[PDB]
Design a binder for this molecule. Structure first.
Ligand SMILES: Nc1ncc(-c2ccc3n[nH]c(-c4cnc5ccccc5c4)c3c2)s1
Length: 273
């Protein structure tokens, strides 16, 4: 079933997310990525319309799979005796945002604006479709270098979006908000906005702002690179200590620092080609 349809290539990487291989769809040569997840490592299960018991990750990906290219598309999946296999699209050439920032150091504001805008559009898309990622960070964002388009990956820490409190969290700690650190409680939207502030700081400073719990709780942001005041203000706003003081997605995208964003294609021509 999986054997003849996909020709398997090298290992792209592995972690809490599982093991992901480069691959090619045999019928039409399409570039793909092939992700294996062991059943024993999955603590979070869900259910399709079908009533079939799958990993929540699969539920979340199917709910967001549509014309929109800001989220990695699930092309197919398969169950095996001890694992699930996911076939995802693979842009070529591609690089993850963590590697891209490591190579360049801090990004120019114009490039950070375009990237961040695209992450925002993509997270809004997820929220629209009832999905909360819960692990927004540079390693979970791929750059299609030709088109200048970003894609969210790794929905393995995600959840159905809801308006009531969350008391579980298995995403990345240094991107998690102070209310989680202190009370093991958070709400979806406001926690997401906090991770987005961490991500934006990361883009423009070349590194995340907080390491330890106490830095997160104190929430004092020091800028290690030259960053415009508008951007500093947006960042500080997203990282407000009280959840209710954080901006909505609308307020972020109406922020003065976010005006006049480049198109993705313009972004590739100026900064990636
Ligand atoms: N940790 C991960 N979970 C899913 C991942 C994933 C999913 C779909 C992908 N399409 N293309 C890639 C990918 C990612 N990183 C690369 C790094 C170098 C070269 C090619 C790459 C392709 C995907 C990775 S990575």
């Amino acid at each position: 079933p999986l054997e003849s349809q996909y020709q398997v290539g090298p290992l792209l990487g592995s972690g809490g997310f599982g093991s992901v291989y480069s691959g090619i769809r045999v019928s039409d040569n399409l570039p793909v990525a092939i992700k294996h997840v062991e059943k024993d490592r999955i603590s979070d299960w869900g259910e399709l319309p079908n009533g079939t018991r799958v990993p929540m990750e699969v539920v979340l990906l199917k709910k967001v799979s549509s014309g929109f290219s800001g989220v990695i598309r699930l092309l197919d999946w398969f169950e095996r005796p001890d694992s699930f296999v996911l076939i995802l699209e693979r842009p070529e050439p591609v690089q993850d945002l963590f590697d891209f920032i490591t190579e360049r150091g801090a990004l120019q504001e114009e490039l950070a604006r375009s990237f961040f805008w695209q992450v925002l559009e993509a997270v809004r898309h997820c929220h629209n479709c009832g999905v909360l990622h819960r692990d927004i960070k540079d390693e979970n964002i791929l750059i299609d270098l030709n088109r200048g388009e970003l894609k969210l990956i790794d929905f393995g820490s995600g959840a159905l979006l809801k308006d009531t409190v969350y008391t579980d969290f298995d995403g990345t700690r240094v991107y998690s908000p102070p209310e989680w650190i202190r009370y093991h409680r958070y709400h979806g939207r406001s926690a997401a906005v906090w991770s987005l502030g961490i991500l934006l700081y990361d883009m423009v400073c070349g590194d995340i702002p907080f390491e330890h719990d106490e830095e997160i709780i104190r929430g004092q942001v020091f800028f290690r690179q030259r960053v415009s005041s508008e951007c500093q203000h947006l960042i500080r706003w997203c990282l407000a200590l009280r959840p209710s003081d954080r901006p909505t997605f609308e307020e972020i995208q109406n922020h003065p620092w976010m005006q006049d964003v480049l198109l993705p294609q313009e972004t590739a021509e100026i900064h990636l080609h």
